[PDB]
């Protein structure tokens, strides 16, 4: 019902059709279908913060036309 954009690791931007109630895991699944990267290697960032599995897009206040950034799984240490 809404579209968001994802800046991918492959050097381009893709558009996804999503809903507020969609989980982050669901979005990562779609990204895997398009980019061929497994969800566990995906780190999605919106407004400077990581999006966690188990939450929805609406939990992050992600509205129509939002841009999410795809980077690689990371850990501080």
């Amino acid at each position: 019902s809404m579209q968001i954009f994802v800046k991918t690791l492959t050097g381009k931007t893709i558009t996804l059709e999503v809903e507020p109630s969609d989980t982050i895991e669901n979005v990562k699944a779609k990204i895997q279908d398009k980019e061929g990267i497994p969800p566990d290697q995906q780190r999605l960032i919106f407004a400077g913060k990581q999006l966690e599995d188990g939450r929805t897009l609406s939990d992050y206040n992600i509205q129509k036309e939002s841009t999410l950034h795809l980077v690689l799984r990371l850990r501080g240490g």
């Binding site: 800046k7 400077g48 950034h69 980077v71 990371l74 240490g77």
Partner: protein
């Protein structure tokens, strides 16, 4: 390395990320300065943080060296601004542009790893008193980043 670095610079200009800027300090393409906006709804909100970036001669087959010059309170970043983060060391990938690196660093701010800390005392506070952690982090942001 040089052509790739210019490519990074072009990527940034065409398609800037909302919380980050970076570029050569001088005419030296191997030494850059960067800025990261403190994420909203965190102890770093309102903050502006400056960093330095040194690309190695074999970039991007080796990661850039990235450090904060703005003081920041965080378990994974020390008083020298050194950042202990795996994509800056053995988990590096050449697919990560400096833009993606700065974004990753921005995301580390609210997603610290207190279990493998750079600064044990800070990690201890984070795990034992979170309100105290948040309070100090906000104080440092107000003092240093604002």
């Amino acid at each position: 390395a040089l052509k790739r670095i210019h490519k990074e610079l072009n990527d940034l200009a065409r398609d800037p990320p909302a919380q980050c800027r970076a570029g050569p300090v001088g005419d030296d393409m191997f030494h850059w300065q960067a800025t990261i906006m403190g994420p909203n709804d965190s102890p770093y909100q309102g903050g502006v943080f400056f960093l330095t970036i040194h690309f190695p001669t074999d970039y991007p087959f080796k990661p850039p060296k990235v450090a904060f010059t703005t003081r920041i309170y965080h378990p994974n970043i020390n008083s020298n601004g050194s950042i202990k983060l795996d994509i800056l060391r053995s988990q590096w990938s050449p697919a990560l542009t400096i833009s993606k690196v700065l974004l990753s660093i921005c995301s580390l701010l609210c997603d610290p790893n207190p279990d493998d800390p750079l600064v044990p005392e800070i990690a201890r506070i984070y795990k034992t008193d979170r309100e105290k952690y948040n309070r100090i982090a906000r104080e440092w942001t107000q003092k240093y980043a604002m």
